[PDB]
Subunit: 348 residues, 4 copies
């Protein structure tokens, strides 16, 4: 419910912006969130990442702790470069020798004052000679349209390109108008594709104390830890660390809402998740309230599996204001710096 | 009274330690700010603690606390001249920002010295090389001889010692608590000093009774401080000498593991044997430091004091530590550090 | 030959006192060598390695001065674990973008004061768990795999030296035993049908270029660090592989290990002639330096040369000694159960 | 001059990387020299040492490779602390059972951007706790007064000064160059020293001529050294005839100044100790002609008659720091260049 204490980490953010590199995380001191990070690369991009770790919170903590040092090595923000760093991160994790176990979600957000066409399916961008996230979950198949933003009115004030890198079950939704849409697909034992990929490589699933586990240990078919299920004695990776990259464009006024599996558990239908996200308000001055709400009523339906939420309202223009607040009742981080108003929240 | 809410800032401290430099001021959000602890690039075994009691506004004070570490990094070494060189620099720039002048300052340099060198000493205070008078003598106390100390032949210095440098400029106080003995670390720059009183008046200054209180120029409740430029060697009255000095009083002292540094704004007092007695009798300890600080604020309010209250307390450990911890909470405004050879704590209440 | 030399002496005495050292030797060219490195916690192990740079030595220098941190992270010194680290070094090489790439040869020598039993074919050990011997791979005859018990075998009385060879490229490693010599590694280039079929099968295409068969008409190796332009970095498959060819052999005291860059073994070119020459070169525990240097001068057979020779001692030790000198640049190690030497062409 | 030299560059980068190092030069033959070293926890403070051994290199060689061990034990760099370590060393050396024989000269050089003040006798810094005499007057020079020097209000070196500590024990010499000026930093421990000859002779020891010149007890070439235990407090010598208590002096130098040192052989043939100062005064106030500077001293001492062995050292106190690192051990004869940050030193030996 209502909050009672807060501090102003503000000064910390001011010095960061000025140096061109920063990474603000928020762990509750199993999941760890990096509310917002900045790459030495592009001053126009902001990374937001989530790490839900199984069996420990050690691998997730490691992940969120070194990620910006790896992403800082991308030479361009695209699928293969993203995927390169991922396998590189997994590799070093195995060298960190920690009790394996962690999913991952990295959201890349870039603002383009003057965007130029690209090939699009609905709101998603097709990069190369493809199936939509929408076609994945139900959703009717559909036609790619050559989209020219140059002459698009809604792109009058620029647009926000979004790269979503997901390995696991953390979810990401784009909210726009009175509609909501998934930006990534869960890598669970639910999906028939993943389930089939695993079993077709010689992987066996088994119900263990109430839920499906790969080899009776991994609660995912795709994740960062569990090297006991990656090659090395297996011939193939049963649990993949290959981040499947997704790209979406967004207009000013839309919002990015993301969270760990916990934040989205207990919804009769995956359709009901979008309907519930498309229902909530979440205005610029209520981003945080929104982030916190998500946790609050996520505990009303009952699951205290870990819970982490994140909200970001996309701005019409830049604000030279700056503000970063941390508060408590679960932990809440608010960041209001130059073209983003964001916040995450996590209960115990 | 009792604490209700508190947040754990451990991540922020873990990161700072890794960077080799940090600041962290406790601010009540009225007139004072506290740099509970900060690191200097280079100085690995040194910590810093500062206190700023704002006069007619929190402006100058907040300015000082915001830049204090920016000047301390330009120290080639922690000296009396080197620190006084920085004071001038700060006071100089404070005027550049021309805010409503007004701020007392109490800065504490503490370094861990495993195997310190010999030094001429007047019971705990260290006499500089190359004309000495001690905080003790000054506060009109029995005057002792300077005696050469050999830490090689001293069992109390077996597990190292902490060297303390204090730069006082104002009425803030710093005491050293060693078992059931307690000692002052500086002289409050007030009209109660016959040394300060002489200086101001000789330079032409005029103290005068205003609203029951005696103020320099009937404005400044101190003979030393940052800002208050109408009495500095500033310009309009083309004063030929600082009536109010920005020249800090720097003193050195050594402590043993187990000792506690006790510090607070002039408001934390309204007793000086009393001050000493009280501190010498308080139950400071590793897992009590925070309480120790809170109690000090409580004790004074209880002692019916209306001025600003800010208290700081650090318990000097025997062995260096490995864990880390930082909490910020409310009942008043508290923040505590638990890193390495450091166990810090501070408090403030409007 | 021999005009001036130092005593990095103390330098090697304390690094030895910490269980971790990594002294390299480079020209003052393109290749660089870690004449000897020690990994933390493996007192009876020693690493030697050399890196041949292709198109600018920036990439090889990286590797030689980073290789140890990586090795210090391997759980056990075996095929899987070693390849494990190659995959990683390759990756961190990318993020530190340098042109070209490098060939690599790493040698791990471990002293077994008390051998046991291992399945071998000649001096080569077959890993516990389809073996193709190096000798057979080079043109030598197929030989039965046979169980060997070092337990009471006299040759192994004073103990044995187990050797792991990680090879990526065309650098060569050989074991000299008396007037005989065998190969511990084998290059994997385009001249290899098998290696060639790997590339083509993955969609890579070789094409002759100015008298030279090049992968994609750019790189000359099929395995090396770098050349990411042909790495999986649409390249959905690695064309140039960083995955090393690892092999194990065992040596008895008295025999020597001899390694060198492609330049060192350039114009003999009869897998057999290279071996004969080495078999024929005399090497006492007092001439390793002469050796290493000789190998470089003998290269004055119309040619970038770098050599490494090491004489495995019968005894447990003698003491500290590390000399560096010039005519060509040389580095010389002498501690515990080790007598090392390295040399390079200016 | 130089025919074959060689870059030890990388070693000094790694060494500077970590906090300490010590680079002795030796060979070509009883003396050893620590061209440069860095006590841990002590930036902008470098060391330079020289060990000239009598009939045997073992006593010198133990010192040159064990001194930085003791030096890192100094709780501060001053007389009391420097003298105490000499004690331990001479003590531990006795247990090494080496063929006694070696003089010593140690130079500590610290730079302070902002010097404060000291009581000074024309360049020499008088220590706190005053009957001060020392170098200049002791070498029979014009008496100069003790002044209260305030570096804070001194024009020269508004960019700092270099504090020099010399721990001399034996017949080696160390001089400070400044412009066209030459100045001694130590007094040799020989029979020529009225004080030394006096101390020894009042202690019971006797000088007597053996094969040419006179030696303490008929064996020692100097009155102070590290070995020669037969003359250290079995006769109940309750007084050290051959002391191992060094003569510690302190001086400051302005940037642009140079420090020059050498074994007794380097300065071997001069009609006077003034002749030496004169000569060294001729030498290039080396901006970076340092290496040749040292070299010349070798050749020249070889130009005058060479008797014992010869070793030289030169350091130039730069106006500014530097990021360029370079170390070159080379052989025209044996020599090594040292260039790093505020440092620029040169080593040299032959025999």
């Amino acid at each position: 419910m209502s909050l009672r204490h807060l501090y102003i980490e503000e000064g910390r953010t001011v010095c960061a912006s000025a140096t061109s590199r920063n990474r603000r995380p928020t762990s509750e001191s199993d999941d760890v969130v990096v509310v917002e990070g900045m790459l030495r690369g592009r001053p126009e991009t902001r990374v937001h990442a989530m790490f839900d770790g199984f069996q420990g919170r050690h691998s997730a903590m490691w992940l969120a702790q070194n990620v910006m040092n790896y992403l800082n090595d991308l030479r361009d923000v695209n699928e293969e470069e993203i995927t390169r760093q991922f396998e590189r991160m997994d590799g070093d994790l195995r060298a960190a020798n920690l009790p394996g176990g962690s999913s991952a979600l990295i959201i890349f957000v870039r603002y383009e004052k003057k965007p130029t066409e690209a090939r699009v399916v609905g709101r998603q961008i097709v990069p190369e000679g493809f199936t939509s996230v929408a076609e994945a979950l139900g959703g009717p198949l559909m036609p790619v349209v050559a989209m020219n933003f140059r002459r698009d009115p809604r792109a009058a004030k620029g647009i926000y390109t979004i790269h979503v890198a997901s390995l696991g079950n953390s979810r990401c939704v784009l909210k726009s108008g009175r509609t909501a849409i998934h930006l990534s697909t869960p890598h669970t034992a639910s999906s028939h594709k993943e389930r089939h990929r695993v079993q077709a490589a010689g992987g066996v699933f088994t119900t263990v104390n109430g839920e499906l586990l790969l080899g009776g240990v991994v609660p995912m078919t795709r994740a960062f830890g569990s090297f006991d299920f990656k090659k090395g004695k297996l011939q193939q990776d049963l649990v993949s660390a290959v981040p499947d990259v997704t790209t979406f464009f967004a207009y000013p006024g839309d919002d990015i809402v993301a969270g760990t599996a916990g934040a989205f558990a207990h919804f009769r239908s995956h359709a009901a998740i979008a309907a519930a996200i498309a229902l909530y308000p979440v205005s610029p001055e209520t981003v945080l309230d929104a982030a916190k709400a998500m946790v609050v009523n996520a505990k009303r339906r009952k699951v205290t599996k870990n819970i982490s939420t994140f909200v970001r309202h996309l701005p019409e223009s830049r604000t030279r204001s700056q503000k970063m607040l941390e508060g408590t009742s679960g932990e809440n981080g608010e960041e209001d710096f130059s073209i983003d108003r964001t916040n995450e929240l996590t209960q115990a």
